[PDB]
Amino acid sequence: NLAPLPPHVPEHLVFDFDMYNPSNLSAGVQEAWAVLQESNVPDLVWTRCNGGHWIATRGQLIREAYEDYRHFSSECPFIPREAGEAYDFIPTSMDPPEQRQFRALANQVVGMPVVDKLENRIQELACSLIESLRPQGQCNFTEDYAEPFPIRIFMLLAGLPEEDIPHLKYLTDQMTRPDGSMTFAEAKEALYDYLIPIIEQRRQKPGTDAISIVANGQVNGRPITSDEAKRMCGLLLVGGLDTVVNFLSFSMEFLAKSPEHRQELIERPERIPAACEELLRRFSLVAAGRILTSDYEFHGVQLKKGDQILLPQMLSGLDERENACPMHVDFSRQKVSHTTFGHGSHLCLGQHLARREIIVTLKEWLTRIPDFSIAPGAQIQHKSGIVSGVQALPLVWDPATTKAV
Ligand code: HEM
Ligand SMILES: CC1(C)[C@@H]2CC[C@@]1(C)C(=O)C2
Ligand SMILES: [K+]
């Protein structure tokens, strides 16, 4: 369970936080992680859980370390070590300088130009899914919307059949919130087993889908290899199937529990983009990290080459030193500070797609189902990992209070 303490780590920095099962999980996952920001907890701690690793607990350190790729490398970006070692996606397992040439290609398939004209289809799917639920007066939000909306958009973009979703979603989840049945390496290899033949098919016969574009792409003017294409497409699948999917459920759970915030967005719909940003701060959900490239003293702590450091994207915006009353949701917050989409050279490329999906969801849901609540007697359970989420979100409403557009 707890790994032996390395010789260079002092006892007074030991805080045995378990990122895959944090002790305060029942309070909400963000709340469970925020225990690391109680006043008695140092800026940088060592946990003996999950093989042993550092955790930066404050936005200042998280930001600094994400900027300093020379000391803090993306070569091994996940805890536990076996996962970070097996992780070879592109561009996320690379540091500058080599990383950068791959970002332009990834931008061609998930960047703003692609969003801007997926626009209509995103809007259409949100409206159709929500209208189908509306007269029922209930739904299981995770399965009925949070999954199918972003995942079907991604499968469309990638030119992949919707009947492949259960398999691909299972595999993706083993990389972020493993159930124990597969190691990271096994889940990754299964994803590659799916992708390799499709990549060769689309290098032989190119389409207009994201996989064809990556597979036939150029990287700073030279052809991408089949291997590189596979390593990029693996990442695109995880972003498509396990990011927005979880975030929408945190947001909708909050709106179900806060009628005042629902009413604010109904009355002042122009605030929806700002609300999206504030929700991205409050219900931030990613916790990746880096590996030390050399011995390095950082904020008075001796780190050794090979040490892993968890740098939770989630924590920066929850830090009271970045945002006053950080657990409070304020759509009028003037400077919404967060690192929800990362920081430094690996800033999320999917963020424009994510914001569109969020904003469309908020607008189109509140237009049709302005009044809803958590199902009677339900206690909402979160789950923690590289990406955190919501296990189930049963919602109810009176259909008489809804509106078919
Ligand atoms: C709420 C939704 C999302 C969040 C919170 C999120 C978060 C992040 C974070 C924290 C990173 C940086 C990881 C690191 O520094 O090691 C990242 C990178 C990336 N994300 Fe997102 N992501 C989201 C949605 C998406 C989607 C929908 C896609 C595409 C379908 C996507 C594609 C990417 C790509 C390609 C990178 C790699 C950038 C690089 O390594 O240079 N993301 N994301
Ligand atoms: C940390 C991430 C959210 C980012 C996009 C998908 C993800 C799980 C990665 O492997 C990089
Ligand atoms: K690796």
Side-chain angles (χ1 to χ4, degrees):
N1 185 252
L2 302 180
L5 192 61
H8 69 288
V9 184
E11 281 285 358
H12 71 272
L13 293 186
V14 175
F15 185 111
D16 296 310
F17 182 81
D18 181 351
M19 65 170 289
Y20 288 104
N21 186 33
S23 56
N24 184 220
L25 186 60
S26 65
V29 69
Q30 288 80 13
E31 289 84 354
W33 285 70
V35 308
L36 289 164
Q37 297 172 326
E38 289 169 11
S39 56
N40 61 304
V41 184
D43 290 351
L44 183 55
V45 298
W46 178 270
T47 176
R48 291 178 292 169
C49 301
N50 300 117
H53 64 88
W54 298 104
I55 311 169
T57 66
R58 294 286 175 175
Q60 182 184 259
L61 282 74
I62 292 163
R63 289 166 187 276
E64 290 176 7
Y66 279 126
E67 292 173 21
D68 183 2
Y69 56 86
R70 307 181 159 186
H71 289 110
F72 300 105
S73 173
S74 293
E75 167 105 326
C76 183
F78 281 13
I79 300 307
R81 195 173 299 273
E82 290 76 4
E85 287 180 345
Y87 188 104
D88 72 339
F89 290 165
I90 292 179
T92 39
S93 67
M94 297 171 161
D95 299 311
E98 73 176 312
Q99 171 210 177
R100 313 193 161 274
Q101 57 193 329
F102 296 99
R103 289 178 60 88
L105 182 57
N107 256 299
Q108 283 199 306
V109 298
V110 298
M112 192 70 81
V114 167
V115 181
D116 276 348
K117 285 84 94 264
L118 280 178
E119 181 181 326
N120 289 346
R121 293 284 293 268
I122 294 173
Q123 178 81 7
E124 282 153 18
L125 182 55
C127 292
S128 171
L129 291 169
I130 296 163
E131 178 47 34
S132 185
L133 297 171
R134 188 195 53 72
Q136 296 173 185
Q138 61 181 81
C139 70
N140 300 124
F141 186 80
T142 65
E143 68 184 57
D144 290 347
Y145 187 91
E147 291 166 16
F149 169 64
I151 294 174
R152 297 180 194 172
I153 293 304
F154 179 80
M155 299 295 275
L156 171 70
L157 170 66
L160 298 171
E162 287 183 4
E163 66 181 2
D164 290 358
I165 292 167
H167 177 64
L168 295 177
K169 177 54 172 161
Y170 181 80
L171 294 179
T172 291
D173 288 0
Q174 299 324 298
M175 290 182 288
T176 55
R177 293 177 305 286
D179 69 15
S181 75
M182 300 184 82
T183 58
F184 188 101
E186 289 165 345
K188 197 196 63 160
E189 287 304 333
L191 189 60
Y192 287 167
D193 185 60
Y194 178 90
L195 287 167
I196 294 161
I198 298 171
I199 287 163
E200 177 68 8
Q201 198 165 328
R202 294 179 191 187
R203 283 166 67 95
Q204 296 298 161
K205 297 185 193 171
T208 58
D209 62 280
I211 296 174
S212 292
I213 296 167
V214 171
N216 292 288
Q218 292 174 258
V219 193
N220 285 185
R222 58 85 172 169
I224 197 163
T225 69
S226 293
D227 181 54
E228 288 162 342
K230 180 203 73 179
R231 294 160 63 197
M232 182 170 286
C233 290
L235 173 63
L236 296 180
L237 266 63
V238 177
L241 275 54
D242 202 44
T243 61
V244 181
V245 169
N246 298 303
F247 180 75
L248 290 173
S249 290
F250 290 120
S251 292
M252 198 67 66
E253 174 193 7
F254 169 79
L255 292 175
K257 289 174 177 182
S258 197
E260 290 58 40
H261 286 87
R262 302 199 300 263
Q263 198 51 34
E264 184 176 354
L265 300 184
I266 291 159
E267 293 179 4
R268 292 164 190 101
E270 69 278 5
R271 300 194 174 178
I272 288 169
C276 171
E277 209 66 19
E278 171 68 347
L279 294 165
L280 281 162
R281 182 198 65 79
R282 176 58 180 81
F283 300 106
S284 199
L285 71 169
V286 180
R290 300 288 184 256
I291 188 171
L292 271 290
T293 60
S294 71
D295 292 356
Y296 182 50
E297 178 183 306
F298 188 59
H299 291 252
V301 179
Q302 188 59 243
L303 314 179
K304 295 295 166 196
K305 186 170 175 159
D307 285 353
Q308 297 190 266
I309 183 166
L310 185 69
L311 301 167
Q313 283 85 351
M314 181 198 297
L315 284 182
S316 303
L318 303 174
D319 191 343
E320 78 269 13
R321 309 178 189 167
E322 289 206 12
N323 301 284
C325 303
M327 287 299 158
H328 172 63
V329 175
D330 181 2
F331 297 155
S332 296
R333 202 179 271 280
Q334 295 295 306
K335 188 169 181 176
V336 178
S337 182
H338 68 80
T339 56
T340 292
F341 288 123
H343 188 72
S345 68
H346 290 270
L347 199 52
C348 180
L349 290 170
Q351 63 179 278
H352 311 301
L353 179 58
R355 290 191 178 90
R356 178 63 63 81
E357 286 178 348
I358 294 158
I359 291 170
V360 167
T361 294
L362 292 172
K363 170 139 208 72
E364 301 309 326
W365 188 278
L366 292 169
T367 298
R368 291 167 179 77
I369 312 173
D371 184 71
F372 55 101
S373 53
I374 305 293
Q379 317 108 245
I380 305 306
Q381 177 67 238
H382 292 176
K383 44 190 182 183
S384 190
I386 305 279
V387 183
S388 292
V390 178
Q391 203 66 259
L393 182 58
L395 301 179
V396 296
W397 59 89
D398 180 356
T401 69
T402 73
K403 172 74 180 171
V405 170

